[PDB]
Design a protein around this nucleic acid. Structure first.
Ligand code: ZN
Lengths: 122, 108, 433
DNA sequence: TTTTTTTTTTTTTTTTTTTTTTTTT
């Protein structure tokens, strides 16, 4: 049970063995995952906050649950979450979402995804 | 759909005429709505800036922009701040190169 | 004849003139489709360096034939894509010896460059950073016995030996030999009468402040005819074997790092801290969860004292050890935190110092915050997760009433240096390309 | 075609195994 650094593209290319199962990326279970991206839109609901998020490789929705005014459009963020499917759509269900520390983290993150992919793959 | 937006340096401009790219650099000069940027590449790039941009008071910047058909000019769509008032450009160069080598992760 | 830099898969008629700078031991294996042997050699000329490898029958044919620092005509071998995971060189290509391969030794050494040395004096080593290549010369003082240990990392026996090296700096440092070079060490001539030993490409470990270890690619010479060695020979024989020396220290781990970097899967797979002797390690991990209940305990208000206190009969806080009571308790952390990386998830415990930076608040400050709303208190904890650290840890056995659990303790947690963690990853990646 | 860079070492502080984002689009 793991925390996989991934690009939105990998999220989008992850296979779901049809029915409604666990996702699979590079022949490995894709549960919890993390990535860095730029907020492009913010939609606020009673139940959740939905962000449209994009990292130069693809775009995805991440919704985090209420039970964030620092976060705004056009801002880098670290996303921690679980990959989920509803009705043929993929989105991240997130608990934690933080304004990126410095830009070097964005760079560090791409490498971490490469490195991870390389290690599951050889 | 969202087309991937390559992270590029100045030498890759030729490969994306008419396409939207993403580029990082240290601000050299700002002359009206034109920005002069130094890339990890060590090459400089002319960026045409949106009316609302306070780039002047920032050190490193990330531009999402469309490459213009003359050489290495640029119509800024969006712009992202960094440094202080400490981006590592060598790190950046390497990420550019490495990202180019893994299109399964960074592209279509 | 071709320069080394000239070699490619696209040309098949070639011969190189090169000197062997280093040579591997003979490696054996087994698995599923295979099980065999190989060795490799590094080669140098005016144009550059290249790795060559022989498999199975090529070992029998060439292993005896090729000797370090000697110069050879090599011909009619395959140029292959380099496997950089197994090499220190930057070359895009490497050479594989086939059965048609011609090797004949040369009488001219003048065309071919000789291994250059950039020596670091033993006293200067503390300025070189760990896990880095370095060159060292000095007098051999003595050497350890050969020890055989199954590395928890691999799970295959290893021959090991330690040498004590000394220079004009009056400081001594330990250096580990591995494998066949380790065993055969006293075979070499003049080894007992205080020889000079010269090392090329040696790993700097921080075990005992600074210590040394060899790589596959590393090289040592015994009394080379080099101006530096005559200086030491002259020096040692005149007043060197007269004065006393310094150990460096800050049994056997010369060249090792007191807490090698590991992944969570490695830590568990290697059963670290499952035997009596504690283990130490570093892990880059992300805080995923902090346990709310029992985050902190009420502690003794005595200077220097931290024992847990309890309410007495006059509703004061009583300490046993210091046998007294205070109106106000001190609050100290007993942090229980779940951290994850790409290989797994693991529980860590932290104490007052390290847990404070993990929350950005002393345990007292947290307590007060909880007294105003649970919401702002869980925000603080919720805010503390999704953050990345280098964790320095020990792993030990605790004995909870007969039963026995391993625990992982944080001794230091530093926030990740993204730039530098980045360059590490670059290096790591380039090895797959 | 084919395989890896190896080891080693200490606090004072509660209880003993923890719940990670919970349901809408
Ligand atoms: Zn006390």
């Amino acid at each position: 049970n793991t925390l996989r650094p991934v690009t939105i593209r990998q999220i989008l290319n992850a296979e779901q063995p049809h029915p409604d199962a666990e996702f699979i990326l590079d022949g490995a279970e894709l549960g919890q995952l993390t990535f860095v991206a730029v907020v492009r839109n913010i939609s606020r609901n009673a139940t959740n906050v939905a962000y449209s998020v994009e990292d130069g490789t693809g775009q995805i929705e991440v919704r985090q649950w209420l039970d964030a005014s620092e976060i705004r459009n056009n801002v880098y963020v670290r996303v921690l979450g679980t990959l989920k499917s509803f009705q043929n759509r993929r989105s991240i269900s997130s608990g934690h979402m933080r304004p990126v520390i410095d830009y070097n983290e964005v760079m560090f993150h791409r490498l971490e995804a490469v490195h991870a992919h390389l290690q599951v793959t050889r | 759909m969202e087309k991937p937006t390559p992270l590029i340096n100045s030498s890759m401009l030729g490969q994306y005429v008419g396409q939207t790219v993403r580029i990082v650099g240290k601000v050299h000069k700002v002359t009206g709505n034109t920005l002069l940027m130094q890339t990890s590449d060590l090459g400089n790039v002319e960026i045409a800036m949106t009316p609302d941009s306070d780039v002047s008071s920032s050190t490193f910047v990330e531009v999402t922009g469309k490459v213009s058909d003359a050489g290495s000019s640029f119509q800024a769509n969006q712009i992202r701040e960094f440094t202080t008032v400490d981006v590592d450009l060598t790190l950046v160069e390497n990420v550019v190169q490495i990202s180019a080598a893994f299109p399964n992760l960074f592209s279509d | 004849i071709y320069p080394i830099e000239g070699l490619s898969p696209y040309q098949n008629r070639w011969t190189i003139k090169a000197r062997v700078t280093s040579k591997s031991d003979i490696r054996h294996w087994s698995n599923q489709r295979g099980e065999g042997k190989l060795f490799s050699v590094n080669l140098l000329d005016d144009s550059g360096e290249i790795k060559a490898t022989g498999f199975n029958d090529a070992v029998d044919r060439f292993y005896p034939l090729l000797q370090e620092n000697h110069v050879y005509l090599i011909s009619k071998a395959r140029v292959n894509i380099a496997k950089k995971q197994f090499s220190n060189l930057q070359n895009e290509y490497e050479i594989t010896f086939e059965n048609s391969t011609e090797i004949e030794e040369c009488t001219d050494a003048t065309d071919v460059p000789e291994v250059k040395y950039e020596f670091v004096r033993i006293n200067e080593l503390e300025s070189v950073e760990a896990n880095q290549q370095c060159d060292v010369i000095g007098i051999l003082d003595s050497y350890g016995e050969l020890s055989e240990i199954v590395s928890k990392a691999s799970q295959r026996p290893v021959q090991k030996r330690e040498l004590t090296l000394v220079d004009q700096g009056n400081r001594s440092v330990k250096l580990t030999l591995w494998g066949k070079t380790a065993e055969t060490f006293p075979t070499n001539a003049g080894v007992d009468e205080k020889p000079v030993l010269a090392f090329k490409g040696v790993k700097v470990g921080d075990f005992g402040g600074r210590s040394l270890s060899m790589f596959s690619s590393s090289t040592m010479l015994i009394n080379p005819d080099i101006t530096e060695s005559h200086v030491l020979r002259g020096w040692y024989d005149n007043d060197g074997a007269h004065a006393q020396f310094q150990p460096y220290t800050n049994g056997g781990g010369a060249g090792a790092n007191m807490a090698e970097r590991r992944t969570i899967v490695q830590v568990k797979d290697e059963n670290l801290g499952m035997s009596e002797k504690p283990d130490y390690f570093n892990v880059r991990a992300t805080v995923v969860y902090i346990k709310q209940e029992n985050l902190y305990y009420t502690a003794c208000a005595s200077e220097g004292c931290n024992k847990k206190v309890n309410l007495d009969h006059e509703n004061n806080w009583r300490c046993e050890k210091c046998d007294r009571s205070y109106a106000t308790p001190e609050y100290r952390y007993i942090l229980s935190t779940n951290v994850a990386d790409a290989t797994g998830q693991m529980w860590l415990s932290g104490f007052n110092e390290d847990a404070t930076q993990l929350i950005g608040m002393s345990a007292g400050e947290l307590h007060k915050l909880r007294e105003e709303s649970e919401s702002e208190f869980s925000a603080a904890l919720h805010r503390a997760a999704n953050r990345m650290y280098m964790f320095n840890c020990r792993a030990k056995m605790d004995t909870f009433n007969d039963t026995a659990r391993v625990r992982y303790t944080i001794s230091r947690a530093a926030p990740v240096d993204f730039a530098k963690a980045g360059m590490e990853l670059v290096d790591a990646i380039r090895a797959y390309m």
